[model samples]
Target: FVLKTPKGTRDYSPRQMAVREKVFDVIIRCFKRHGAEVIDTPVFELKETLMGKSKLIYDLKDQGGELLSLRYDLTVPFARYLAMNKLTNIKRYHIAKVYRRDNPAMTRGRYREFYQCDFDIAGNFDPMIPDAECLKIMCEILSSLQIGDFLVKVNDRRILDGMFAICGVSDSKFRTICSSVDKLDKVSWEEVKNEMVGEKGLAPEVADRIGDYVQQHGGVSLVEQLLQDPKLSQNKQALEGLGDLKLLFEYLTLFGIDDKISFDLSLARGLDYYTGVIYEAVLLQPLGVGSVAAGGRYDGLVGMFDPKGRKVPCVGLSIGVERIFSIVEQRLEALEEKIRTTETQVLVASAQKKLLEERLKLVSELWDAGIKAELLYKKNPKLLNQLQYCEEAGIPLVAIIGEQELKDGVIKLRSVTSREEVDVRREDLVEEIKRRTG
Candidate 1:
């Protein structure tokens, strides 16, 4: 039998990993600027830890092992961590792989296993303060990557549920109907309406009313319009959520990202746990996949894990890294840019026979000086081949060691780009390579 990965998964080449590392570097730097400390959790969790989406679990008990499941996402496990530790407050970021069992759209960047870069603020704080900050972080992340124009679509769960009430949708059907609305980005309004009325069993009139509000999206003025609408203004929940939106928009304006945000009414994030505001960042340029980064507030999730249902209000965002990967890959392809995979700053080459030891010694010295250096494994490699390897591998500097150089206690340093060579004293080789590489 041939060996291969599962259908929905594929390996990343070193070059692709180079691009991914660059993306992650930008993301992590933004996370750090926001004072987020990194945290980690196990790759798999108990089956019970998962609460949403169809679970992908390993029934290990049936196989004479413990019952376990690959984590579906990072958020629930984070909540579980908070409650299990009885921690009330923390600002943390987690970058890890999550799993799911679903139809995989490989070309579209959907996979059975994928990475999530999550930043969360968990504490009882002023309303919409953390919410606004989450939007700020999203803007910072996207701007740092230069990922083309994008917009952070914002809505509040309270507002969504409140609108449901105004539309005459029962509380029990609110979440279900909201789930149908979340598909507006991917599906047509008519299709969503059909699903709501046919499958979800909503009244045709209610679906039409929901469609009317969901279709409306705008800036601060739109909020004012909704607040003044006779039906919504009279609804207490709508008024409360709208007031929170006004505060959030004011905070975002202060953060200077209000222009990058939209008060979208249809952004019903698929998660049921969002107790307050919800948001999703979508690329204005078509990238096939939906929403590059999206998340929101989940005030009651932690309480579910708490014995007494103690609550911890939290707000955060998860970077859709796989989608980012696809976008970056496409950009790189369009630009026809080369990505170097290795960190080797200098490659040690030997010109004369049996001078490999001298080359090895110099490589070790450069490495000791905290410089990235490498040497070929062959007992004796041709000088021309060694130089070509440096150029092909994108190594910037080449240190040549020969019998003459060993006798003189000096080495020829060659620049890979200019092909300019300079003789330097062996003692200064590390410093010279550092300067050249830099």
Candidate 2:
């Protein structure tokens, strides 16, 4: 029998799960603080459901009746949920695994099957109000994690399309060329421009014009300057986008996180579904780990599910929590910190053999008294080995039973860290251990 998990997946040890649980705890608290409720959907969807944009999926073979595919991402299924329920407004958070039939890069925290943490807000609200709150939530969560500093690059489809038009690019070529811009994160600007001119069949002059526009990035002042650009100002949609971005920046300013944001024209999202502003959050590190969280306004996604094409403005975010978990794991490893997977407050042990019965009864008493206690499963274990177990497992205290302790009705409580031992009366062992541990 094969024992391996799928090629792109692996099992997590209890120690590894300890770190994951801590990270998720902080993320969930942050989500709840922002007025979000929880929701869940099936792990697989109808095969026809994902066909519209099923770029990468693990499709199940039809057993004569129906076909199915594992969910690719939580966002699409959430949109379907809203449309099916005819929900016009809701704030929800979801954390679950998603599937993709792609090459796995374990070292880089990329996987074929991994957890996705998402937060989405849907409704027709005042312009940029929800977007600002989305950004705020991201900032709050990232800051709460203490991972490190990050920057969210903000842009819009209206601006990207208009900039292309003003650069003399064909309206039909806007999205394709936008994909080339999206690569600027990993590749150089020169490389991207060359791809546009050489591969995409765009004139060198037009590519140069795009290069000029995409190269500029800054705060609200930059948006103001773009609003003044004669050719760009002539494009109505682009002008509207610039105005909205300017407003978004203002809201971020009041939220007190504007310094962590940038208006970079080169921050083009390759996805064509985004109707308005979009953003990607990246570590501001010399050794950056690429994007950790990213999302944008997909005002039309829900409408795609509706029979009547009823539109609902939705802005959502998906975070790469696996990446954060990796980062935290590395940091703790570098610091040489040991993580205790279990909450064992004390270990029940015997100083001499023939005390298994006494140890079992004592441990049971500790357990029923609401204490996290454990004892040797073997009938006779070396006292030295029992203490060593506590040391290795990071257990704090050890309760030792001996011939004299049995006769005197007292227990020898030893601290693993300091090797300090005290005679704790049998009736007071629980309180003594808790007080010492606490």
Candidate 3:
């Protein structure tokens, strides 16, 4: 029988891991530079801890009959942390692997299991701070990767709620529409129409109106006309959120971020917890991947634990790590050469057996200086096979530590690039390798 990993998971060998490390490094550096602290949570949480909180996680039973589950997303677990400690006034974020067991939705773009990177600022209604930071980190992340031609589709759930109100639907019906909005990308218009028409508890007319409004106009501008008397400044929460978005766009524009900003009113993220603005970043190049990153606000969630606790408004973003990886893997697959990294760079060769101990000491010195060096592990002492071994492993630098070099305490370094040889003193070995590799 062939051994294979479970269906949804994958094994990443060394070459693939290099690319993964690159993405993590760039994103984490940007997060650190912008004052975001890191917080890591368990891969598993209480099923009730995640129950009804998010539609995204995988829940199961443990051997002890306790309800345990793999965390579906980071935001809810972060909320549990805040509630458990009764935390107040803080900005923190977390990254973890989430699991979901379900048939992949072929009609739309979504996955059964993937990793989500999230960081939310809690305990404040100034949604602008979280909103601004979100866009800032997102833009910096893209800039670091040099990914041009991506746009942030943003909107507010409150705006959509108000529109549902205009259609005269009951509050319960509105929730149905909100939930169905999560499926906007999945099902066809007729199918969603029926679901809204009481199949899922929404009135037919209300769903039609909501769908019509979303299709006719782009983001806030069209919604602006819909709410001609939008009382934006008067509504404290909505205006505060909108104000933060404005400031973020202003700063990003000054940084030359053009053709990347747009207000998408229909961006009703499926999460029931989102109480404010939501955003998703889409790549313009039209690859096999969907949104490279996405997130939204949910200040009402923290209060769910302590009903009397002050309203904790939170906002965050989740970078689509797996989707972006797929895109990059596909892009690189077409190229003839692959980028790679390895443990050892140069293999010291010996043409004669008597030079072994001296060459070992020389190799030790090279390694002590931080250049990854290795002595030939074979007993045959053949020069041809040693050279072939270095080439097959893709080691760019090789050094020949021969008897002549041992006599002078100098080693000759070979460059894979130009195939040139440079002679250097024993004392300067470390400095030479650092300058070249770094």
Which one wins on TM-score? Answer: 2
Model 2 lDDT tens row, 1-438: 798998998889998999999999998998899979999999999978888784878988888979998999787798789888888889999999999999998776679999999898899999999999999998888888888888888998899877888789887887788889888878899999889989999999999999999889888999999988999989998998999998999999999999988888988874567888889999877334579898799888866888888789989887889988888888899998998899898999997889999899999999999999998899999998988889888999999999998789889998889988999798888889878876
- lDDT value, candidate 3, whole model: 0.68
Positional deviation of residue 417's Cα in model 3 after best superposition, in angstroms: 3.2
lDDT ranking, high to low: 2, 1, 3
Q: On residues 229-267, what C-alpha lDDT tens digit does candidate 3 reach at each position? A: 344445554554455555555555555553466665556
lDDT (tens digit, per residue) of candidate 1 on 1-438: 679988677798998899899999999988899888888889878765664535554334546665677787787788789888889889999998877777888766678788888899999997888888888989999988987888888888778877888789998878788888988888889999989899988999989999999988889999999988999998887888899999989998899998988888878875567777788888885332458888788887766788888888888888888888878988988998777889888888887778777777777888888998899998889989988888888888888887887788878888889989999997787677766666
* Over 4 Å off, model 2: 406-408
List TM-scores for all candidates, in order.
0.92, 0.94, 0.83
lDDT of 1 at 46: 72
In model 3, pairs of residues that clash are: 299-313
Order the candidates by TM-score, highest first: 2, 1, 3
Better of 1 and 3 by TM-score: 1
Worst 10 residues of 2 by lDDT: 283-292
